Design a binder for this molecule. Structure first.
Ligand SMILES: *C/C=C(C)/C=C/C=C(C)/C=C/C1=C(C)CCCC1(C)C
Length: 227
């Protein structure tokens, strides 16, 4: 085959792999129970992403969806990746500020709708409806972001400054990155088809890598993970 975006897939594969191993190695040398918790979660995130990037690199997770009079290439392997990586990231943040069980369930469920409608939208054949699904998926995301910003930040105030200040950073990196995904989708292959697939793939690998390995390095080097 040799599609124009493969080099971005090979690069996402690579970065996700090194990040997985470094976290794995750093996580099995720590004795603290809580630290082990955050470590097991944060290493699983880039591990799921590495397998998904590898599959796509090798020709899987791709389907030709018909709409707009064209045969559009939609990488569905992404949603298979984000379906488990996104709620796991949310969990790290909820465990950090001592989010309540009810809070966590609702964030994971919201996350579920977001990825579900997102994929359903990316597979829809009626061009206009693709945007009806995209619309719902984004509304779910804003719910998640509102909670992280208005709820979590508030509960992180009963924590120590070291924990509150680490969460702020992760909360900020998450808000900036997640907000970018609905936009790439809209002007890319699953949407308006303005940005070509090769560029779109590069945009996604930068967000995925920053939101997983970036987020991970920040959380795992902090002392807020210790019980
Ligand atoms: C490691 C991956 C991360 C942090 C992925 C975050 C992904 C999102 C915030 C995705 C959002 C989407 C929408 C708001 C609507 C359209 C489809 C999605 C799934 C691309």
């Amino acid at each position: 085959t040799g599609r124009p975006e493969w080099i971005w897939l090979a690069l996402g594969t690579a970065l996700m792999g090194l990040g997985t191993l470094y976290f794995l190695v750093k996580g099995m040398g720590v004795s603290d129970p809580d630290a082990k918790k955050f470590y097991a979660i944060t290493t699983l995130v880039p591990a799921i992403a590495f397998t998904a990037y590898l599959s796509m690199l090798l020709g899987y997770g791709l389907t030709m969806v018909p709409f707009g009079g064209e045969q559009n290439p939609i990488y569905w392997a992404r949603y298979a990746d984000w379906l488990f990586t996104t709620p796991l990231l949310l969990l790290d943040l909820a465990l950090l500020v001592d989010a309540d069980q009810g809070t966590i369930l609702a964030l994971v469920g919201a996350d579920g709708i977001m990825i579900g409608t997102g994929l359903v939208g990316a597979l829809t054949k009626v061009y206009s409806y693709r945007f009806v699904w995209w619309a719902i998926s984004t509304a779910a995301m804003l719910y998640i972001l509102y909670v992280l910003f208005f709820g979590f930040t508030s509960k992180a105030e009963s924590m120590r400054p070291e924990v509150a200040s680490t969460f702020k950073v992760l909360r900020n990196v998450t808000v900036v990155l997640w907000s970018a995904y609905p936009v790439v989708w809209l002007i890319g292959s699953e949407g308006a088809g303005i940005v070509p697939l090769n560029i779109e793939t590069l945009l996604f690998m930068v967000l995925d890598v920053s939101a997983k390995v970036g987020f991970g390095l920040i959380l795992l080097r902090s002392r807020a993970i210790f019980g």
